[PDB]
Design a protein around this motif. Structure first.
Motif, PDB file in Angstrom:
ATOM      1  N   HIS A   1       0.381  -1.061   0.401  1.00  0.00           N
ATOM      2  CA  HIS A   1      -0.042   0.011  -0.171  1.00  0.00           C
ATOM      3  C   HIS A   1       0.703   1.386   0.289  1.00  0.00           C
ATOM      4  CE1 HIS A   1      -2.968  -2.769   1.978  1.00  0.00           C
ATOM      5  NE2 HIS A   1      -2.656  -3.043   0.805  1.00  0.00           N
ATOM      6  N   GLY A   2       1.924   1.178  -0.657  1.00  0.00           N
ATOM      7  CA  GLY A   2       2.450   2.188  -1.272  1.00  0.00           C
ATOM      8  C   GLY A   2       4.164   2.305   0.060  1.00  0.00           C
ATOM      9  N   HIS A   3       4.174   1.566   1.140  1.00  0.00           N
ATOM     10  CA  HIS A   3       5.094   1.913   2.541  1.00  0.00           C
ATOM     11  C   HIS A   3       6.024   0.828   2.594  1.00  0.00           C
ATOM     12  CE1 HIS A   3       1.190   3.799   3.475  1.00  0.00           C
ATOM     13  NE2 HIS A   3       2.162   4.902   4.324  1.00  0.00           N
ATOM     14  N   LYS A   4       7.060   0.951   2.327  1.00  0.00           N
ATOM     15  CA  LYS A   4       8.049   0.602   2.253  1.00  0.00           C
ATOM     16  C   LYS A   4       8.607  -0.689   2.927  1.00  0.00           C
ATOM     17  CE  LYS A   4      13.125   0.370   1.256  1.00  0.00           C
ATOM     18  NZ  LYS A   4      13.881   1.367   0.816  1.00  0.00           N
ATOM     19  N   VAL A   5       7.662  -2.135   3.234  1.00  0.00           N
ATOM     20  CA  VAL A   5       8.544  -3.513   3.963  1.00  0.00           C
ATOM     21  C   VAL A   5      10.585  -3.013   5.083  1.00  0.00           C
ATOM     22  CG1 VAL A   5       8.354  -5.569   4.557  1.00  0.00           C
ATOM     23  CG2 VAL A   5       6.680  -4.373   3.473  1.00  0.00           C
ATOM     24  N   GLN A   6      10.037  -3.010   5.462  1.00  0.00           N
ATOM     25  CA  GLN A   6      11.043  -3.176   6.113  1.00  0.00           C
ATOM     26  C   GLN A   6      11.842  -4.260   6.407  1.00  0.00           C
ATOM     27  OE1 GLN A   6      10.682   0.818   6.495  1.00  0.00           O
ATOM     28  NE2 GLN A   6      13.335  -0.296   7.006  1.00  0.00           N
ATOM     29  N   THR A   7      12.623  -4.623   5.320  1.00  0.00           N
ATOM     30  CA  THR A   7      12.820  -6.121   5.429  1.00  0.00           C
ATOM     31  C   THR A   7      14.002  -6.241   5.845  1.00  0.00           C
ATOM     32  OG1 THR A   7      14.632  -5.586   3.787  1.00  0.00           O
ATOM     33  CG2 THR A   7      12.454  -6.463   2.790  1.00  0.00           C
ATOM     34  N   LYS A   8      14.718  -7.540   6.161  1.00  0.00           N
ATOM     35  CA  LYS A   8      15.907  -7.697   7.096  1.00  0.00           C
ATOM     36  C   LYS A   8      15.669  -9.025   7.095  1.00  0.00           C
ATOM     37  CE  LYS A   8      13.713  -9.379  11.070  1.00  0.00           C
ATOM     38  NZ  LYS A   8      12.867  -9.204  12.393  1.00  0.00           N
ATOM     39  N   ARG A   9      17.757  -9.246   7.573  1.00  0.00           N
ATOM     40  CA  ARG A   9      18.320 -10.424   7.735  1.00  0.00           C
ATOM     41  C   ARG A   9      17.932 -10.780   9.361  1.00  0.00           C
ATOM     42  NH1 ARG A   9      21.994  -9.196   4.181  1.00  0.00           N
ATOM     43  NH2 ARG A   9      22.920  -7.148   5.325  1.00  0.00           N
ATOM     44  N   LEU A  10      17.732 -11.691   9.337  1.00  0.00           N
ATOM     45  CA  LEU A  10      17.435 -12.329  11.104  1.00  0.00           C
ATOM     46  C   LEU A  10      18.928 -13.200  11.138  1.00  0.00           C
ATOM     47  CD1 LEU A  10      14.108 -14.816  10.206  1.00  0.00           C
ATOM     48  CD2 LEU A  10      14.124 -13.561  12.349  1.00  0.00           C
ATOM     49  N   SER A  11      19.527 -13.582   9.770  1.00  0.00           N
ATOM     50  CA  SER A  11      21.174 -13.514   9.979  1.00  0.00           C
ATOM     51  C   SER A  11      22.630 -11.839  10.953  1.00  0.00           C
ATOM     52  CB  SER A  11      22.176 -13.756   9.316  1.00  0.00           C
ATOM     53  OG  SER A  11      21.853 -14.819   8.326  1.00  0.00           O
ATOM     54  N   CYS A  12      20.943 -11.616  10.341  1.00  0.00           N
ATOM     55  CA  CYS A  12      21.526 -10.063  11.512  1.00  0.00           C
ATOM     56  C   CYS A  12      21.239  -9.129  12.372  1.00  0.00           C
ATOM     57  CB  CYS A  12      21.831  -8.757  10.253  1.00  0.00           C
ATOM     58  SG  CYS A  12      22.421  -9.163   8.770  1.00  0.00           S
ATOM     59  N   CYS A  13      19.943  -9.539  12.949  1.00  0.00           N
ATOM     60  CA  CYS A  13      18.796  -9.242  14.135  1.00  0.00           C
ATOM     61  C   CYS A  13      18.810 -10.105  14.782  1.00  0.00           C
ATOM     62  CB  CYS A  13      17.861  -8.961  12.400  1.00  0.00           C
ATOM     63  SG  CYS A  13      16.112  -8.971  13.831  1.00  0.00           S
TER      64      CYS A  13
END
Ligand SMILES: Nc1ncnc2c1ncn2[C@@H]1O[C@H](COP(=O)(O)OP(=O)(O)NP(=O)(O)O)[C@@H](O)[C@H]1O
Ligand SMILES: Nc1ncnc2c1ncn2[C@@H]1O[C@H](COP(=O)(O)OP(=O)(O)NP(=O)(O)O)[C@@H](O)[C@H]1O
Ligand SMILES: [Mg+2]
Ligand SMILES: [Mg+2]
Ligand SMILES: [Zn+2]
Ligand SMILES: [Zn+2]
Lengths: 462, 467
Positions: A258-270
């Motif tokens: 809906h126009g709002h970027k998804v804060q993609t993430k790496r579980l390897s880093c989180c």
């Protein structure tokens, strides 16, 4: 290679009902959506916009549109879309997720009755109209799919059979949400680059109460499941935003809901004290190691388990292995991640499981052993489990209860996990010592700085 | 007219794609077993014809005496999605026109199907080996029909029939019309189907995924048996035994009948809790049968059937989800009609996850209700269990084999048995020593049901109430 001609022999033919049959493989609507997201990624799209166009004249009330600026499709590729099982991506050493020639059709037919796909490439704009409504209304047992093509600059039809093109466009205008060539062209201009795809799934599926299965009202920035969330439910299973965040282990394509970027993430880093364990795959070496990344999810210890990626695509999430299968806090909160190549394990028809259950369970046992090894390596016994957890704000005796939101504990947790972030322009992932809408390298460094990847401490098993 | 328009077409690779839905090879086999059932077969023989020249070393054959298939039905087999079974008020398990193809392509590279009916015998040859060897991107399936009486080809295109038979002899395990007719004569009755899946799948070690050597009377998974593994998941014999809530068709694996069973009948203090599913009427009720598995406490959990076909088994619900022993050992059974929930592509899950979870929550509530009703934990769960032989503490260990316990357990659970002639499920009053023998109604000690014509006394399961 054939020694003779088989023109007269019977062919295994698709039927209009096989579209629903194919769709039934998706007991995970988010997997059905992930199919289109995977197609967008394989198209080398820098971003996919998953928005909803309100349409009260269509079942579900809104159309689900997947707009990506990927490579798009030429007329031949668009035709190959309806060639079930056909996948040019199924090549050796390929980084592409599509291999079954089925994901788009299965996912779209699970999400909604019909889907109209607009794709653009070098000099052609092609519309692929898979209208189950058309088949139902006209008593079509086959699966007839109009594939009109226009010249992307002149909008003149590019076809060899004018009558065929006329019939195709008439069907599109009649059974699609776009009743004129003007509307079709308007949907084509939603692909502003020289190439891109716009998959619009409409006439969505309705729950028993007549409402769409996908909830886009409770959170306009998210595509949720229209269903009450028991505290034991996982965001990746109730929130498509959360699901798409971790849908890929190496997310390059940006995802906007809906126009709002998804804060993609790496579980390897989180994770807290992440560690990579090398596992030697006998199958992998026969067909040619894996990287079991383990870390404690201090932010949410109940969101633990193994996250199995296959060709960088999430297949199994929150898969409890090793001591996590026992009743106890041992290995509780430890998150595991592994990107399994296709030579090792292939995905299932819905890409929510693994076809080879035997080797999948072998991998799960190996990951449980490595998880126990990681738990020993961090050696929480040196600290103690309860003291360790309450250090991060888990004062409550409860396990699923989130940690206390005191700034002390927030800083305690954040100081261990570097805050990575993806640049909205060059798509590279950066880091900062110590945002929702947008961010670039200059907002620390610049877009040309080489991607300083996360180097994870390497452990060994036994 | 849409003759000019493009058509969504299958491709050779889509056979494998369709096959990948079966992460449960026993589900792949269950697809063919369900086809045999839907064919009104009174018997399906699932045997292995040893063939060292074929990948896997043996051929997997599903021989049934059902209605068979005429040439039109055989042609409709390869019409993916085509399923005449998909009709209202239909007890047929097939709806997706896919099960046979998905299961066969999961089990092995190719499958050659021999079906017989009124005087036309048809062979359907879906040879992935043919396509691989001759570079066919389509899915070309020879469908030659002979006259079942004269064995003369029944066809309109003689060249078509010649090509079909040549492909069958060239790429199938049957290189001559004599061998084809032998496989046709393996259907002794006037109608029947013989699905032979050959060139089986091989594990990494080069051995077939199906173990038919460890137990010659069973088709096991060629993979170790972790204590947690369920017999229904490592033994196709047990899987087929509990594969249907109302088994009529007899399943023979390697010639030995499968002791089909109804968990409803095979449980202690069974109780039927009627659940009024609002979805049933919305799409227009269920029967949640709960019972304590005294014989095997660890083999608990809901066994959800869909249109009398097992979909989810050992599905922990209600208090069983907690690590506590509450509702531990209680087996639940429900035959969900197709109107309520439909199955997944592989028939191993339910397409509507939300409503399946709603059903699971309802079953858990009814399971707690049943737990309170029987009040075994109220009287003492530990003593209740050790009375039946579970004197130990491990929940996974089986009960003591002492004859005292054996009798204590068998006394509560009445012994049911299916007559091998009329397929009627009879109930006997005393312990039976016996693998499934050729028992028939005539050998029933009970005179009320010592006949194959005697009406089948269905189980008188008590009906509990919720809330
Ligand atoms: N957004 C897109 N951009 C470009 N090409 C696309 C897009 N969506 C689909 N295609 C093409 O259409 C084909 C069919 O899609 P799909 O049914 O998803 O099969 P697949 O992606 O090849 N394999 P899988 O996803 O494993 O089923 C793809 O393989 C691409 O060639
Ligand atoms: N053993 C059999 N005896 C008779 N008819 C059969 C047999 N196997 C297959 N058929 C026919 O072939 C069709 C295709 O089989 P299949 O691919 O299993 O689809 P289905 O059984 O109709 N539905 P599903 O099993 O839910 O995928 C069936 O529907 C029957 O009409
Ligand atoms: Mg895809
Ligand atoms: Mg079937
Ligand atoms: Zn940048
Ligand atoms: Zn009898």
């Amino acid at each position: 290679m054939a020694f003779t001609n088989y023109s007269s022999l019977n062919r295994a033919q698709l039927t209009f009902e096989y579209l629903h049959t194919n769709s039934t493989t998706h007991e995970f609507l988010f997997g059905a959506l992930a199919e289109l997201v995977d197609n967008a990624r394989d198209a080398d799209a820098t971003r996919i916009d998953i928005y909803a166009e309100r349409r009260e004249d269509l079942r579900g009330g809104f159309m689900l549109c997947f707009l990506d600026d990927g490579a798009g499709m030429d007329p031949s590729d668009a035709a190959s879309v309806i060639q079930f099982g056909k996948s040019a991506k199924r090549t050796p050493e390929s980084t592409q997720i599509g291999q079954y020639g089925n994901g788009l059709k299965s996912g779209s037919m699970r999400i909604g009755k019909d889907f109209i796909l607009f794709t653009k490439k070098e000099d052609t704009m092609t519309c692929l109209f898979l209208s189950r409504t058309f088949h139902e209304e006209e008593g079509i047992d086959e699966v007839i799919v109009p594939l009109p093509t226009w010249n992307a600059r002149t909008r003149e039809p590019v076809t060899d059979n004018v009558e065929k093109f006329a019939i195709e466009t008439e069907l599109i205008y009649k059974y699609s949400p776009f009743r004129t060539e003007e509307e079709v062209m308007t949907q084509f201009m939603k692909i502003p680059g020289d190439s891109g795809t716009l998959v619009i799934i409409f006439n969505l599926k309705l729950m028993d109460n007549g409402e769409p299965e996908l909830d886009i009202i409770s959170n306009p920035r998210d595509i949720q499941m229209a269903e009450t969330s028991p505290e034991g439910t996982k965001p990746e299973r109730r929130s498509f935003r959360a699901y798409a965040a971790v849908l890929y282990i190496d997310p390059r394509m940006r995802i906007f809901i809906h126009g709002h970027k998804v804060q993609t993430k790496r579980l390897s880093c989180c994770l807290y004290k992440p560690r990579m364990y090398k596992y030697t795959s006998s199958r992998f070496k026969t067909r040619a190691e894996l990287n079991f990344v383990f870390g404690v999810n201090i932010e949410h210890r109940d969101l633990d388990g193994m996250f199995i990626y296959n060709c960088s695509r999430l297949i199994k999430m929150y898969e409890k292995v090793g001591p996590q299968l026992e009743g106890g806090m041992a290995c509780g909160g430890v998150v595991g991640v592994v990107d399994v190549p296709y030579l090792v394990l292939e995905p299932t028809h819905n890409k929510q499981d693994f076809a080879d259950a035997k080797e999948y369970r072998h991998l799960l046992r190996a990951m449980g052993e490595h998880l126990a090894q990681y738990w020993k390596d961090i050696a929480i016994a040196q600290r103690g489990i309860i003291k360790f957890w309450d250090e991060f704000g888990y004062l409550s005796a409860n396990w699923n209860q989130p940690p206390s939101s005191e700034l002390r504990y927030k800083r305690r947790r954040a100081m261990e996990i570097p805050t990575t972030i993806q640049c909205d322009l060059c798509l590279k992932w950066r880091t900062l010592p110590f945002y929702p809408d947008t961010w670039v390298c200059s907002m620390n460094d610049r877009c040309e700085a080489s991607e300083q990847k996360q180097k994870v401490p390497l452990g060994t098993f036994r």
